[PDB]
Amino acid sequence: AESILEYFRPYLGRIEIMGASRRIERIYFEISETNRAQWEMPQVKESK
Amino acid sequence: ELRDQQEQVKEDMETKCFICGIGSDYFDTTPHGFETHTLEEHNLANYM
Amino acid sequence: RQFIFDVVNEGGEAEKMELFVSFCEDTIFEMQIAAQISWGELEVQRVKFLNYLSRNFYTLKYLALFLAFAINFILLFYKVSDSPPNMVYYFLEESTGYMEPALWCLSLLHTLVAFLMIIGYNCLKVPLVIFKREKELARKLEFDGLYITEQPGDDDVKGQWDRLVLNTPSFPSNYWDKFVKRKVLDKHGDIFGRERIAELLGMDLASLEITAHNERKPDPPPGLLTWLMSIDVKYQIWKFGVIFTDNSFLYSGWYMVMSLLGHYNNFFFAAHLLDIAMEVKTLRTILSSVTHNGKQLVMTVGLLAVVVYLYTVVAFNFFRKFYNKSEDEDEPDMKCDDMMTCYLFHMYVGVRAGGGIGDEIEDPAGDEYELYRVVFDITFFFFVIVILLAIIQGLIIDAFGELRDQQEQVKEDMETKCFICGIGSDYFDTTPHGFETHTLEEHNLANYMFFLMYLINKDETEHTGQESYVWKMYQERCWDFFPAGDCFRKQYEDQLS
Amino acid sequence: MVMSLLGHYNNFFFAAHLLDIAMEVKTLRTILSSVTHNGKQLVMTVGLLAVVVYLYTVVAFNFFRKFYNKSEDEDEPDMKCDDMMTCYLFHMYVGVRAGGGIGDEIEDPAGDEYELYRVVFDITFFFFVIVILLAIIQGLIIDAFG
Ligand SMILES: Nc1ncnc2c1ncn2[C@@H]1O[C@H](COP(=O)(O)OP(=O)(O)OP(=O)(O)O)[C@@H](O)[C@H]1O
Ligand SMILES: Nc1ncnc2c1ncn2[C@@H]1O[C@H](COP(=O)(O)OP(=O)(O)OP(=O)(O)O)[C@@H](O)[C@H]1O
Ligand SMILES: Cn1c(=O)c2c(ncn2C)n(C)c1=O
Ligand SMILES: [Ca+2]
Ligand SMILES: [Zn+2]
Ligand SMILES: [Zn+2]
């Protein structure tokens, strides 16, 4: 699955929150194209 | 002072994280790891 | 020394390793050139000649400097008279007739060694500046498809001028890899037009006569005279459009056209007193410190022009009765009867001096706009003389601190760390001198380079077994075998210390 | 020793010892040490001067020599540019000296004909020796204490 795993590379985000059981756990989720598209415009980048 | 103050950032955002607070060290026990800890694990953007 | 300096204090910290391999792959080319420098007539002679003037490269340089520091001194005896030996520039020698001629024989020399500096550079240093560029085209096609998938930048200049070389059947002339044209044909290949990339990378008859070189190898026909047509003229235009962009062969051009010109007024030979500051290792440092903060210098001279513009508009709309140029009465030469005449009193006699338009504009004791003159002068004195001529001190006095810092990070990060792994001076000091060992028998720059010349020399069938692995990974480029974090002492540190 | 025996011959040579102070006083050694430490960078920068004012001398001698003068007495005596090497010693005694530039010692140039060639020749001189070179000779001292 080096096609699916490669096509969906810039669509899943990995988070490393800690809660409940007092232990580290990982989170996976999905982000839309428009969600990421409105992030690399120069105005936001300079704000970062 | 002003070119100093502009050389603390560029040397404390390249020798530490910004979510945890660990060093560039520990995360260099393997092939490039600090470049990993802030591209798939912690990584500003992902949290937003 | 120069390579080590500019890889710790720029953007490495990850991709530094591929730079090190790139460092090796052109010192490989440099050592080959040095070995080669240490009608049959034509041949032999040409060679022996071009090879004395390519080892004696640095001597001929300093000699030019001495010869011009001379001729410049023989000029400080020119004199002028209205009565000849119109005004005549005759020579007022130290009584003896031995100067009017010698100046005639140290000009022709200054134009022979100048010719060797050009011929000499064209064989000592040009082959390397071509290698460093012919290498990029191959690597930006095999792995990026620059001229197959996309367009280079649509704006750059050294990304489309080189579109003129791919079609000629002589592309790999220096880069060792004389097949940088067949193994790109196979990677992209099917996904793109197989029949159309067969010609856009030159190399015609590829789709038909691919395996034509299967029978045997023929012999080339010798000859002379008629050989002057076997010139791939299209490739020459490309390289002869690259060397004319290098900052070096254009500081060598302006040496030659100052001297030939000097043969026309003999004073143009003054421009070489101005190369001193381009040699003397020390002088480069000082001047480097000046030029480094150089936009902040030009734009601050800018901010001036505009500050004195606001003072000019206030002078012209109010104070013009206070300006004067004569005691002769009838009020001649009033310096504010026009704008632009007024703006050129405020710079020649304005920002100049050390007190301010206050010392060149009558006195204002007799009332009527008095305390409007003293407030107009004091605020001028602080806002240009005390601040703006202190900023132009600050941008220089600070630059020495930054350049002497940047030269004290290296000498303290190449003596408290390794350069292949990344460990500290610490750990490796649990025994008698160990850090001095870890970088004399274990890791040790040099050793890693001389490998890359062992593998190349040896035949393929005999590479051992721990070499066929590090030679099937320099070919593809997958640098992982460097330790980068682990050491033989670190791994086996109990099994036996 | 050979300053004192000599002093027995003019009694003024005994002045050279006022000059040992700066060789004792633990403090004074420090200050002077700071000056001497950056000392090749000081000699070669005084060098770079000599040559910059040589380029200004060659340009003055080949063009502007009618603007130099030395008297009101008529018949044009003491024209300071009638020889090279005479001209190169106006540019240092009354040249790099003062605080405005050969601009204050070389008549005025309001009457056209090579005017805006004088103002451009003076302003570029003022920045390139007074403002920069006498700031470099200061920067090499201030940095040495650091
Ligand atoms: N989670 C993080 N922790 C620490 N540093 C981070 C993190 N995310 C990003 N960075 C810093 O930002 C850099 C990588 O991101 P990026 O290249 O965007 O930074 P930038 O160069 O300031 O921004 P840009 O590249 O958009 O100009 C690294 O130097 C890294 O230290
Ligand atoms: N593999 C290495 N890792 C870290 N440092 C190295 C390595 N190889 C050499 N060096 C550095 O170079 C120095 C030893 O080599 P060398 O004395 O040649 O350096 P150099 O003084 O810059 O060069 P030279 O002595 O030829 O002038 C040490 O200071 C060492 O830190
Ligand atoms: C075959 N080969 C060479 O011949 C070579 C080289 N680097 C320089 N040369 C000459 N490399 C990496 C290489 O693979
Ligand atoms: Ca074998
Ligand atoms: Zn982290
Ligand atoms: Zn090491």
Author numbering:
A (entry chain D): 4167 to 4214
B (entry chain D): 4942 to 4989
C (entry chain C): 4215 to 4252, 4541 to 4587, 4626 to 5037
D (entry chain B): 4796 to 4941
Give excerpts from the publication.
The molecular target of diamide insecticides is the ryanodine receptor (RyR), a large ion channel expressed in the membranes of the sarcoplasmic and endoplasmic reticulum (SR and ER). RyRs govern the release of Ca2+ into the cytosol, driving multiple events, including muscle contraction. Diamide insecticides directly engage and activate insect RyRs, causing uncontrolled Ca2+ release, leading to tonic muscle contraction, paralysis, feeding cessation, and eventually, death of the insect. Therefore, we designed a series of insect-like chimeric RyRs that contain the diamide-binding pocket from Sf RyR and the remaining parts from rabbit RyR1 (rRyR1).
To determine whether these resistance mutations reduce binding affinity or cause structural changes that modulate channel gating, we recombinantly expressed and purified chiRyR-I4657M/G4819E and solved its cryo-EM structure at 3.6 Å resolution. The binding site was resolved at a local resolution of 3.2 Å. Additionally, G4819E introduces a net negative charge and alters the charge distribution of the pocket. The structures of chiRyR-I4657M/G4819E, regardless of the presence of CHL, all adopt a closed pore. This is unexpected because they were obtained in the presence of known RyR activators, including Ca2+, caffeine, ATP, and CaM1234, which typically result in a large proportion of open channels in the case of rRyR1. Thus, the exact identity of the residues in the pVSD, which contains the binding pocket, has a significant effect on channel gating. Our structure revealed that these mutations alter the local structure and polarity of the diamide-binding pocket, leading to the reduction in binding affinity.
